[PDB]
Amino acid sequence: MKEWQENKSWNAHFTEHKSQGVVVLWNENKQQGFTNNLKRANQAFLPASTFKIPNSLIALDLGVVKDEHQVFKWDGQTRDIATWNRDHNLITAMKYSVVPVYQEFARQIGEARMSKMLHAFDYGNEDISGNVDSFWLDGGIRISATEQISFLRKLYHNKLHVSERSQRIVKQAMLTEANGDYIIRAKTGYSPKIGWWVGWVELDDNVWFFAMNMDMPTSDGLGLRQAITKEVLKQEKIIPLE
């Protein structure tokens, strides 16, 4: 069984920001879930660049990626995001959400192995058909915020059907923020109409998993994905007040 609690008080965080969406938290020690909206918590959306987490694991598991230091040379095509127009390793490809590096991984994996692996990870509901380098925003594939949490819990515990090394590498590449109070390992995601933030907050005595998604009519309020999540984390006393 899974314990869930609907906390509509968190709605004020989306409302004060003229936004709509869902924040889902999971308290690992207590085996208890929390969300502002249980309906939307279970609504499946395209993962967008949150798909960089399973893609990284699969690439590492198959040897497409040797380790976190291997260099993926820039193909020489000048794109709008300046940080993409250069060489990268797994750490920086993840940090700058370098889509062409990940399109190349997906093509090397191929749709037969990508499909088998996603079924092994029990990752959303997939229907890839001649779109290996775009299914994460096609889509192609859809995943809910509660399903993002089940997948992340497996990753955190090294329980996915890949080596412990591959899972450790991806968790290192997911490193977003750390200080004396907490460690955040996460992945942002954006594709027309939906923005995501998924990952976890490691504390000394507990791990709080999180998955949020929000309506993004334009690419304007990308900062709200982390800001809204942090407002919920602060309300719940998971992270300190700045």
Add this chain to the structure above:
Amino acid sequence: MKEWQENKSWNAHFTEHKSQGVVVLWNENKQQGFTNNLKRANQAFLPASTFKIPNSLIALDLGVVKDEHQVFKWDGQTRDIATWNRDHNLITAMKYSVVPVYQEFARQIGEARMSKMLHAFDYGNEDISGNVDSFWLDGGIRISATEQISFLRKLYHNKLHVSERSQRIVKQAMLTEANGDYIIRAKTGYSPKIGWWVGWVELDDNVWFFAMNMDMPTSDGLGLRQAITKEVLKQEKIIPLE
């Protein structure tokens, strides 16, 4: 050969804080070292809590520590450091420099295996006299700031004579700070008279290793270990201005 540069301009950082000591930096890409004082950079001191880095590696390698989640229960003895009066895992034992946890690791490792391993690591003067649970607290073990750097470089590259997994785990336990500009993996050290900060700063395109120590007449200016290092890192444009 090893390239060193003495930059006496960094002395103003120790000066302005009514302190004395050394900051040693190593630019990995350029294979170039930098220091305010070459004499003190090579002066050997008690490693104190920086010894938690090889102690962790050896415990993991021998199976004394199964993984970063294994719990070392508090024995119920009330000690001066409030954070020691609780259960720890490898992450929190390192963060809070929990001496009783590490004394237990050392006893399990034993004298013979501790000595062989420190020689395999080329760790300082490689002297474990006298007691296996206190030689780093008040024994004959000595390490210089440049020797801390040689050891840390090996750890960073997974080049120490332990498994890749053990080195990955210790580097995770060393996680101190991370943001969009840099990642710091380090270990503080304090024992009467000397304070240490050793580790590295990971950037997108380089790694800067660091080892500092300073005179600590009392346990008052512990914050200066990190503050002085960061002033040097900011002067050298390694990390941005806050």
